Protein backbone atom coordinates (compact mmCIF):
# COMPACT_ATOMS: atom_id res chain seq x y z
CA UNK A 1 0.00 0.00 0.00
CA UNK A 2 2.89 2.46 0.34
CA UNK A 3 3.88 1.36 -3.18
CA UNK A 4 0.36 2.16 -4.39
CA UNK A 5 0.17 5.49 -2.56
CA UNK A 6 3.59 6.56 -3.85
CA UNK A 7 3.11 5.48 -7.48
CA UNK A 8 -0.11 7.52 -7.83
CA UNK A 9 1.42 10.54 -6.04
CA UNK A 10 4.26 11.02 -8.55
CA UNK A 11 3.03 16.04 -9.73
CA UNK A 12 2.74 15.06 -13.39
CA UNK A 13 1.85 11.41 -12.76
CA UNK A 14 -1.39 11.80 -14.75
CA UNK A 15 -0.40 15.01 -16.57
CA UNK A 16 1.04 15.03 -20.09
CA UNK A 17 4.56 16.45 -20.24
CA UNK A 18 3.82 19.01 -22.98
CA UNK A 19 1.55 21.11 -20.78
CA UNK A 20 4.38 20.93 -18.27
CA UNK A 21 6.45 22.35 -21.15
CA UNK A 22 4.16 25.36 -21.60
CA UNK A 23 3.78 25.87 -17.84
CA UNK A 24 7.57 25.80 -17.38
CA UNK A 25 8.05 28.23 -20.27
CA UNK A 26 5.53 30.70 -18.86
CA UNK A 27 7.15 30.18 -15.45
CA UNK A 28 10.49 31.42 -16.78
CA UNK A 29 8.63 34.28 -18.47
CA UNK A 30 6.86 35.48 -15.31
CA UNK A 31 10.20 34.92 -13.57
CA UNK A 32 11.83 37.36 -15.99
CA UNK A 33 9.20 39.94 -15.12
CA UNK A 34 9.53 39.25 -11.39
CA UNK A 35 13.26 39.93 -11.26
CA UNK A 36 12.56 42.97 -13.46
CA UNK A 37 10.04 44.21 -10.89
CA UNK A 38 12.62 43.52 -8.19
CA UNK A 39 15.04 45.70 -10.17
CA UNK A 40 12.67 48.68 -10.05
CA UNK A 41 11.84 47.86 -6.41
CA UNK A 42 15.48 47.86 -5.32
CA UNK A 43 16.37 50.96 -7.35
CA UNK A 44 13.55 53.02 -5.84
CA UNK A 45 14.37 51.64 -2.38
CA UNK A 46 17.94 52.86 -2.87
CA UNK A 47 16.56 56.18 -4.13
CA UNK A 48 14.53 56.71 -0.96
CA UNK A 49 17.53 55.40 0.99
CA UNK A 50 19.84 58.14 -0.17
CA UNK A 51 17.06 60.72 0.14
CA UNK A 52 17.11 59.63 3.78
CA UNK A 53 20.91 59.87 3.77
CA UNK A 54 20.78 63.40 2.33
CA UNK A 55 18.32 64.55 4.99
CA UNK A 56 20.50 62.85 7.64
CA UNK A 57 23.53 64.80 6.42
CA UNK A 58 21.60 68.08 6.31
CA UNK A 59 20.24 67.55 9.83
CA UNK A 60 23.70 66.62 11.16
CA UNK A 61 25.20 69.75 9.59
CA UNK A 62 22.41 71.81 11.15
CA UNK A 63 23.12 70.31 14.57
CA UNK A 64 26.86 70.88 14.18
CA UNK A 65 26.69 74.51 13.09
CA UNK A 66 23.96 75.26 15.64
CA UNK A 67 25.86 73.89 18.64
CA UNK A 68 29.02 75.68 17.44
CA UNK A 69 27.07 78.90 16.82
CA UNK A 70 27.56 79.81 20.50
Amino acid sequence: RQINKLIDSLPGVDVSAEEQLRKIDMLQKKLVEVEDEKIEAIKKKEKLLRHVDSLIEDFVDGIANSKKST
Binding site: L55, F59, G62, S66, K67, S69, T70
Partner: protein
Protein backbone atom coordinates in the same frame (compact mmCIF):
# COMPACT_ATOMS: atom_id res chain seq x y z
CA UNK B 1 25.94 85.40 58.93
CA UNK B 2 29.43 85.48 57.43
CA UNK B 3 29.96 81.80 58.23
CA UNK B 4 26.70 80.83 56.48
CA UNK B 5 27.76 82.97 53.53
CA UNK B 6 31.13 81.20 53.59
CA UNK B 7 30.16 77.54 53.39
CA UNK B 8 27.65 77.90 50.52
CA UNK B 9 29.01 78.81 47.08
CA UNK B 10 25.53 78.99 45.54
CA UNK B 11 24.34 81.82 47.78
CA UNK B 12 27.55 83.81 47.24
CA UNK B 13 26.96 83.49 43.51
CA UNK B 14 23.42 84.73 44.18
CA UNK B 15 24.84 87.34 46.57
CA UNK B 16 22.73 90.81 34.38
CA UNK B 17 22.91 90.25 30.61
CA UNK B 18 24.04 86.63 31.03
CA UNK B 19 20.44 85.51 31.54
CA UNK B 20 19.43 87.33 28.34
CA UNK B 21 22.28 85.64 26.46
CA UNK B 22 21.16 82.23 27.73
CA UNK B 23 17.59 83.02 26.66
CA UNK B 24 18.83 84.01 23.19
CA UNK B 25 20.87 80.82 22.80
CA UNK B 26 17.91 78.73 23.99
CA UNK B 27 15.51 80.38 21.54
CA UNK B 28 17.92 80.12 18.60
CA UNK B 29 18.53 76.42 19.26
CA UNK B 30 14.77 75.93 19.63
CA UNK B 31 14.04 77.65 16.32
CA UNK B 32 16.77 75.76 14.45
CA UNK B 33 15.38 72.52 15.89
CA UNK B 34 11.90 73.53 14.70
CA UNK B 35 13.23 74.36 11.23
CA UNK B 36 15.12 71.08 10.84
CA UNK B 37 12.12 69.11 12.13
CA UNK B 38 9.89 70.90 9.61
CA UNK B 39 12.36 69.98 6.86
CA UNK B 40 12.34 66.34 8.00
CA UNK B 41 8.53 66.31 8.10
CA UNK B 42 8.34 67.74 4.58
CA UNK B 43 10.94 65.34 3.18
CA UNK B 44 9.76 62.11 4.83
CA UNK B 45 6.14 62.45 3.67
CA UNK B 46 7.15 61.26 0.18
Amino acid sequence: CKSLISENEDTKDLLPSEWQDIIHQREQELQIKRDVLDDLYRKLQR
